[PDB]
Amino acid sequence: KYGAQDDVNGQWNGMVRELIDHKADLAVAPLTITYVREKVIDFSKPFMTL
Amino acid sequence: LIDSKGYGVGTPMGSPYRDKITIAILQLQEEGKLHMMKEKWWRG
Amino acid sequence: KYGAQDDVNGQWNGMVRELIDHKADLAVAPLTITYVREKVIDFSKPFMTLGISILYRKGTPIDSADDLAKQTKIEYGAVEDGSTMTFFKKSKISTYDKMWAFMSSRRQSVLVKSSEEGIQRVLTSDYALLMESTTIEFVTQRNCNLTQIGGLIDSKGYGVGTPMGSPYRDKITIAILQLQEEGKLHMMKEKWWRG
Numbered sequence: 001k002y003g004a005q006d007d008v009n010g011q012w013n014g015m016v017r018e019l020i021d022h023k024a025d026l027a028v029a030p031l032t033i034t035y036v037r038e039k040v041i042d043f044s045k046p047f048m049t050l
Numbered sequence: 051l052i053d054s055k056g057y058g059v060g061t062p063m064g065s066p067y068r069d070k071i072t073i074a075i076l077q078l079q080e081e082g083k084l085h086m087m088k089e090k091w092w093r094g
Numbered sequence: 095k096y097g098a099q100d101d102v103n104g105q106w107n108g109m110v111r112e113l114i115d116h117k118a119d120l121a122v123a124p125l126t127i128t129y130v131r132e133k134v135i136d137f138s139k140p141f142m143t144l145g146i147s148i149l150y151r152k153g154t155p156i157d158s159a160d161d162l163a164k165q166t167k168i169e170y171g172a173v174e175d176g177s178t179m180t181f182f183k184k185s186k187i188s189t190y191d192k193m194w195a196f197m198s199s200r201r202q203s204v205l206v207k208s209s210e211e212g213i214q215r216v217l218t219s220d221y222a223l224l225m226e227s228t229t230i231e232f233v234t235q236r237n238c239n240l241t242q243i244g245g246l247i248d249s250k251g252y253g254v255g256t257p258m259g260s261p262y263r264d265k266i267t268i269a270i271l272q273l274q275e276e277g278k279l280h281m282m283k284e285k286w287w288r289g
């Protein structure tokens with residue numbers, strides 16, 4: 001999974017969760033920069049805009 | 051395009067790599083290298 | 095001025111300098127997010143994403159920068175010393191390097207001193223103008239026989255500038271992303287660009 005928040009327990013999954021938990025240093029993937037994600041991880045500026 | 055959004059490299063909140071990667075990405079873009087990379091992987 | 099670094103004493107000017115010196119909290123302007131600037135100030139994520147493209151008259155077979163690059167009958171150029179000309183002066187990309195060879199050699203004929211002069215040249219002669227796609231859209235909304243040719247030639251964004259370390263940077267980024275997703279920045283763009 002890329003990363004979404006569970007609507008009941010508020011826990012994240014996917015690459016976003018790996019970052020939150022400091023299991024990864026970087027997620028290098030077509031990870032869409034979104035409002036809900038940018039609140040919980042730090043994105044680089046976009047390498048692709050679409 | 052019907053909406054606008056971007057793909058970014060994710061880092062943990064507070065990571066020192068975030069701004070370094072941003073500057074490197076901006077330089078790669080300006081140098082034309084990301085455009086070359088896109089054509090390499092997308093052209094049929 | 096928007097903000098550039100002096101090549102001899104390394105000092106900044108413009109809005110970028112106001113931020114560096116903490117004379118301003120925010121620069122809210124179409125401030126292009128670039129490598130050299132992002133090293134010295136903190137930008138929000140872009141509120142607009144755009145690129146260089148081509149302004150030309152409608153109703154022709156020209157469809158790309160390549161079509162221009164591989165001929166000489168149709169002249170083309172850019173505003174002298176602007177960001178667009180600067181891109182071409184530096185591209186090691188093939189087409190754009192050829193284009194710059196042409197523009198540089200015939201510079202007295204094809205580099206214009208202002209956007210306004212450039213637009214008149216497109217309207218009154220067989221000439222195409224390289225410029226930022228945001229400007230091209232503004233122009234083509236107001237000049238029904240002109241059009242953008244091709245897509246974007248580079249990619250860049252405009253961001254809100256803040257001083258390095260500002261707590262407002264990430265707050266503004268989140269607000270901009272929400273405004274985008276809600277469709278509000280698109281509405282704002284149409285409000286100010288539609289002819």
Ligand SMILES: O=C(O)[C@@H]1C[C@H]2C[C@@H](CN3CC(F)(F)C[C@H]3C(=O)O)CC[C@H]2CN1
Pocket residue numbers: 002003030031032033
């Ligand atoms: O970050 C994300 O969640 C997404 C995941 C992934 C999503 C795909 C596109 N979707 C895959 C899908 F097939 F499931 C539907 C498609 C779409 O929504 O148009 C493109 C590459 C990615 C961009 N970022």
Ligand SMILES: O=C(O)[C@@H]1C[C@H]2C[C@@H](CN3CC(F)(F)C[C@H]3C(=O)O)CC[C@H]2CN1
Pocket residue numbers: 096097124125126127173175176177178179208209224225226229
């Ligand atoms: O941040 C910047 O330096 C620029 C300044 C300003 C630049 C104009 C475009 N240029 C003005 C110009 F006319 F001088 C040439 C034109 C171009 O290079 O295509 C569009 C709105 C701005 C976007 N950001």
